[PDB]
């Protein structure tokens, strides 16, 4: 799969359930107009294929402000990492290297 094909979160309950139901998770908070978030799309696709044990999803901050707020997302892209039922990390910015390091540590 790819950036284009992953689930795009639109609901809070869905978001909360996702944290509870996935052992390893990454959420890509983005904006359609943000250049840096756009730049990370190819990278995410590579990461999705590279780390099949991790669930990757995305959320449009403009479309779902409630979700973004819940994660205190002020800047994009923000990648929120979750492990064993809870959120445990953030990589803020289009840094593919930092993002992969974070994913590897899950």
């Amino acid at each position: 799969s790819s950036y284009t094909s992953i689930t795009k979160l639109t609901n809070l309950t869905e978001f909360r359930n996702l944290i509870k139901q996935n052992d390893k998770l990454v959420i890509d908070f983005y904006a359609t107009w943000c250049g840096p978030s756009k730049m990370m799309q190819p990278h995410l696709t590579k990461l999705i294929q590279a780390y099949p044990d991790v669930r990757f999803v995305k959320c449009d901050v403009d479309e779902s402000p409630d979700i973004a707020k819940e994660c205190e997302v002020t800047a994009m892209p923000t990648f929120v990492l979750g492990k064993d039922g809870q959120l445990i990390g953030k990589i803020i910015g289009a840094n593919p290297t930092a993002l992969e390091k974070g994913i590897k540590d899950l």
């Binding site: 943000c34 002020t74 800047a75 994009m76 840094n95």
Partner: peptide
């Protein structure tokens, strides 16, 4: 740059 910030 690598980030977009939003001030509301």
């Amino acid at each position: 740059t690598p980030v977009c910030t939003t001030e509301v």
